[PDB]
Design a protein around this ligand. Sequence first.
Ligand SMILES: CC(=O)[C@H]1CC[C@H]2[C@@H]3CC[C@H]4C[C@H](OS(N)(=O)=O)CC[C@]4(C)[C@H]3CC[C@]12C
Ligand SMILES: [Zn+2]
Length: 257
Amino acid sequence: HWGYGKHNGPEHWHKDFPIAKGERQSPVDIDTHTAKYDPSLKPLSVSYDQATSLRILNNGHSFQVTFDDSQDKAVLKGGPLDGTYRLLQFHFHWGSLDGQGSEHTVDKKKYAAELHLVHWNTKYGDVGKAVQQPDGLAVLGIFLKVGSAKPGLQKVVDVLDSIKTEGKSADFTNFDPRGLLPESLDYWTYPGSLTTPPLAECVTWIVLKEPISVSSEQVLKFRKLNFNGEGEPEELMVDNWRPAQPLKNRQIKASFK
Ligand SMILES: CC(=O)[C@H]1CC[C@H]2[C@@H]3CC[C@H]4C[C@H](OS(N)(=O)=O)CC[C@]4(C)[C@H]3CC[C@]12C
Ligand SMILES: [Zn+2]
């Protein structure tokens, strides 16, 4: 039932998922001047050398690239995290136009899109158990601006024609997510939630300061995806972002001065 439209979008989600009005909801506006530099924060450890991508899927809300998370092959550690988080999938949020699409904002600035690399804490054994824990998930968030192409994204863009509508999936092996990362791992971090139903308050957010640049042609291909299933009225998969939620009693910490 839930989606991003007038009648089922973010302003409606609290009816099925009352935690939507909870104390640690995501995304948020990152007020860069209010974020506290924390010299105690460790550099983020991103270990993706042995990542095994499996499939690419249109779930009717985004598309995701799924990984083998049955072993510690692609893990996030350090930064604000205690222990080891396995990469499950990455997906994106994007806009109908370049001036919107990101879920996090930076001083109220919206980017064209936001990449989420979703990881779960191995101490909880499976992602279903991890989403029931306040430190279950770590999501690495990367902003996309429009300019030069990101060569590492092109393999993703080129298969989207094969998963146009909700339910479609394809083999997507040997995709290296290191090709999606910016130079700097400087980050902001805060305790938050999933940004779609069920909006579980299980996420340590790690949002990189440095955006990646993608081309207009790359993001145009995201906008050709469909929310609808094949044979239903065509509704472009655009504006699949939740707006910024109240920060309430939280502190955003910066890894950098
Ligand atoms: C209730 C469940 O079975 C959980 C276990 C794993 C969860 C998924 C983990 C991956 C995240 C990514 C994502 O969240 S985000 N934007 O905060 O990274 C959309 C929700 C979704 C699909 C989650 C939906 C709820 C799932 C399926
Ligand atoms: Zn997301």
